[PDB]
Structures are given as C-alpha cells and as structure tokens.
Amino acid sequence: YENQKQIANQFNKAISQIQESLTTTSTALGKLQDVVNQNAQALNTLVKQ
Amino acid sequence: SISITTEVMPVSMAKTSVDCNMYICGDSTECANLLLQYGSFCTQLNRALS
Amino acid sequence: IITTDNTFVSGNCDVVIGIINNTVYDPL
Ligand SMILES: *[C@@H]1O[C@H](CO)[C@@H](O)[C@H](O)[C@H]1NC(C)=O
Ligand SMILES: *[C@@H]1O[C@H](CO)[C@@H](O)[C@H](O)[C@H]1NC(C)=O
C-alpha cells in the first residue's frame, strides 16, 4: 500500500518488455513450431513412399 | 524422531544407433541395390533413433 | 469491533491511497 505506484510501474515495464522480446525475432515458440514440423515431416514421408 | 529415507529415480537410458545398411546388407553391392527398392526406410529409423 | 488486537500500525496517514477516518477501541 505504501509502494503501490512503484509496483504498478514495474508491472507496466515488464509487460512492455514482453511484447518487445516477442517482436525481436526470438525462437521462444519453437516448441509450437516443432510439433507442426513433425506432422509435416511424417505426412511427407507417406506421400513419397 | 528424525528419519532419513531413500528414493531412487531413473533419469536417462543408453543412446544407441544402428547402421541400417551394415545390419541388413553388410558389404554387398547387390543387397544395397535391392534395398533401394523399398524407398526411405533406413533414413526414417535413423531419424527416430537420433 | 475494530480494536488494537486485530490491527497493526504502520506509518502516517499520508501515503496510502484511500485511507479513511475512524476510531480504534482500546481495552485500556
Ligand atoms: C476510487 O475511485 C474514485 C473515483 O475516481 C476516487 O475518487 C477514489 O479515490 C478511488 N479510491 C481508491 C482507494 O483508489
Ligand atoms: C480525517 O481527519 C483529518 C483531520 O486532521 C482531515 O484533515 C482529513 O481530511 C480527514 N479525512 C477525510 C477523508 O476527510
């Protein structure tokens, strides 16, 4: 209650930093990419056979 | 009383690989040309083991 | 009833946003 403004400011800056790290071309969502790749790879094999 | 208890947990196993042509054909040139008729079966099992 | 038993004291009435005026009963 005595530090409310500081806590709100830190919350806002961390929210702002998330949407910059998610813009500067990271590979944090690779776990979601791998699944997609795995599906495609398997299905491509079934065509080539 | 103060007791100390042991719990044992597995984490990993051995990393193994197989040379598909060496297992199936050995050093034969005829067997390799006959195995080429099955498409990509050695690549897929190598990928799974990796 | 708001007494000294179920309440604690911290600071002055100048930094909290939304503080009100009320009495605190003391059992003397
Ligand atoms: C609640 O909102 C009113 C309306 O702006 C404001 O006057 C009041 O100070 C606020 N109370 C707190 C505890 O933020
Ligand atoms: C509480 O009492 C003080 C008297 O010192 C007064 O200055 C203050 O405005 C009062 N609080 C409110 C919310 O009016």
UniProtKB/Swiss-Prot annotation, chain A:
Stretches the record annotates as Heptad repeat 1: 4-49
Tree of life domain: Viruses
Functional summary from the UniProt entry: Acts as a viral fusion peptide which is unmasked following S2 cleavage occurring upon virus endocytosis.
Protein name stated in the entry: Spike protein S2'
Native organism: Severe acute respiratory syndrome coronavirus (SARS-CoV)
Gene: S
Residues of the full protein shown: 899 to 947 of 1255
